[PDB]
Amino acid sequence: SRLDKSKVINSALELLNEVGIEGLTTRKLAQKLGVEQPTLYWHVKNKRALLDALAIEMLDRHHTHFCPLEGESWQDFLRNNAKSFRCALLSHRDGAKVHLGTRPTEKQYETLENQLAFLCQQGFSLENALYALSAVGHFTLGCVLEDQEHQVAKEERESMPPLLRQAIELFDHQGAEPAFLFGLELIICGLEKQLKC
Amino acid sequence: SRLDKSKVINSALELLNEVGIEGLTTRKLAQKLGVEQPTLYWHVKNKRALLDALAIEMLDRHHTHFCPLEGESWQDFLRNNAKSFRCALLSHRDGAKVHLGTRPTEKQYETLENQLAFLCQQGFSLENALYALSAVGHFTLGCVLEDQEHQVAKEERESMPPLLRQAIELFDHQGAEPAFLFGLELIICGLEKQLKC
Numbered sequence: 001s002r003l004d005k006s007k008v009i010n011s012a013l014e015l016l017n018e019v020g021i022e023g024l025t026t027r028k029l030a031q032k033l034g035v036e037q038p039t040l041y042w043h044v045k046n047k048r049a050l051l052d053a054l055a056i057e058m059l060d061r062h063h064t065h066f067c068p069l070e071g072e073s074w075q076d077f078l079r080n081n082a083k084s085f086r087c088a089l090l091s092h093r094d095g096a097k098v099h100l101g102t103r104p105t106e107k108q109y110e111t112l113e114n115q116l117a118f119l120c121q122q123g124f125s126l127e128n129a130l131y132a133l134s135a136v137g138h139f140t141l142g143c144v145l146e147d148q149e150h151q152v153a154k155e156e157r158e159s160m161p162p163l164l165r166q167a168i169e170l171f172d173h174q175g176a177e178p179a180f181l182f183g184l185e186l187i188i189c190g191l192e193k194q195l196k197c
Numbered sequence: 198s199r200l201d202k203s204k205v206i207n208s209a210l211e212l213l214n215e216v217g218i219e220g221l222t223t224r225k226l227a228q229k230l231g232v233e234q235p236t237l238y239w240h241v242k243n244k245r246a247l248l249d250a251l252a253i254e255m256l257d258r259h260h261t262h263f264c265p266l267e268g269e270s271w272q273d274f275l276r277n278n279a280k281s282f283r284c285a286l287l288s289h290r291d292g293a294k295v296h297l298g299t300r301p302t303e304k305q306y307e308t309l310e311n312q313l314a315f316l317c318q319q320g321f322s323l324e325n326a327l328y329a330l331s332a333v334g335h336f337t338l339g340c341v342l343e344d345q346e347h348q349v350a351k352e353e354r355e356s357m358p359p360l361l362r363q364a365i366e367l368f369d370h371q372g373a374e375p376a377f378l379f380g381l382e383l384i385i386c387g388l389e390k391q392l393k394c
């Protein structure tokens with residue numbers, strides 16, 4: 001044990017994959033680290049705090065499109081931002097659940113301010129620009145949550161009208177990705193509309 | 198004890214409110230009913246099955262706009278359908294989590310077939326019509342999940358750029374409802390677009 005925040009979060013990320021969000025505990029975490037449970041406090045207070053750092057960490061590694069490139073349309077940006085957010089959530093077991101209920105923190109202030117200012121100078125009012133953000137985040141979270149639940153819920157469970165069958169089979173056969181890429185693009189047309197004003 | 202499925206689900210709905218989704222168990226349920234745990238099996242196999250019935254029940258009571266009224270635009274219908282779905286999820290503690298990962302069941306076949314056929318005769322292809330449905334459901338679920346988590350997550354936790362502050366305060370001050378009504382309406386403009394074809 002070199003004893004590191006970075007090693008704790010690494011190890012916690014692994015443990016999340018092993019047991020998932022409900023089964024994750026600080027007790028189980030220290031044991032995986034081969035340390036006593038008081039020691040691990042020097043890095044995490046408790047489960048919520050641990051979960052906040054896991055959520056933060058998943059963005060650090062995977063949410064790469066947190067920032068607009070100039071010349072890149074706001075439209076492409078809401079697109080690539082949602083994509084990498086999605087990508088962040090999917091990176092681990094219960095990724096979307098680990099994010100749920102988190103809020104902006106100090107180290108995101110600059111990223112997030114830039115995010116609203118980028119939209120604003122495109123001509124969205126601050127209000128619509130923050131609603132453009134929540135619509136995309138709510139929608140993306142909704143997709144990954146359903147998509148992520150699908151598997152554990154299919155484990156624990158065991159004939160119809162032909163259009164419904166066709167619809168389910170089309171839905172089932174096409175991944176989460178198209179269902180995701182589709183709504184994403186409906187939201188972007190709503191916003192292309194709104195902005196025209 | 199008259200011993201009823203209807204009484205079990207009533208009582209389970211109550212228990213969900215008391216302890217929430219993770220703390221709900223069949224063990225805790227029978228004890229609330231004043232019965233032994235074998236007895237309660239004659240109505241529910243296990244937690245997943247219980248959760249499926251709770252999810253079903255919340256739609257029965259509250260998801261009233263499951264069906265289009267002719268003369269009612271598809272647009273008004275996707276609107277009122279999302280609204281009452283939302284309404285279903287919010288009706289109980291962890292309502293949105295209880296739905297997560299559920300799938301269409303036999304008694305929904307007629308409702309749901311009608312739902313895709315209604316859109317189809319409006320001129321959506323089956324595929325887009327099922328994507329119009331998932332976009333709205335994913336988005337609605339994403340809203341209520343975040344909205345529902347907000348409170349428990351605020352219990353268990355403890356300064357910034359002024360536009361971010363303004364954005365948070367605007368966001369915070371305006372309920373979940375506007376953030377919800379907004380994305381909903383972006384999705385509907387995307388679909389008003391797509392259909393034009």
Ligand SMILES: CN(C)c1ccc(O)c2c1C[C@H]1C[C@H]3[C@H](N(C)C)C(O)=C(C(N)=O)C(=O)[C@@]3(O)C(O)=C1C2=O
Nearest residue numbers: 167168171263278282299300301305308327330333334
């Ligand atoms: C293909 N078909 C669209 C599927 C496929 C997988 C699914 O997991 C689901 C659907 C239909 C949708 C219908 C949506 C609908 N609406 C968009 C809210 C809806 O009215 C209902 C309902 N029972 O009225 C659903 O079951 C629903 O909430 C739902 O849970 C679905 C759902 O779980």
Ligand SMILES: CN(C)c1ccc(O)c2c1C[C@H]1C[C@H]3[C@H](N(C)C)C(O)=C(C(N)=O)C(=O)[C@@]3(O)C(O)=C1C2=O
Nearest residue numbers: 066081085102103104108111130133136137364365368
């Ligand atoms: C007002 N502002 C938009 C708020 C308010 C409450 C919130 O709970 C949140 C935001 C910003 C959004 C930004 C979205 C952004 N995007 C739409 C995916 C985003 O890029 C980030 C990010 N850190 O890059 C978020 O924090 C974000 O995922 C997020 O978690 C937010 C979030 O949790």
Ligand SMILES: [Mg+2]
Nearest residue numbers: 099102103137
């Ligand atoms: Mg967030």
Ligand SMILES: [Mg+2]
Nearest residue numbers: 296299300334
């Ligand atoms: Mg569903």
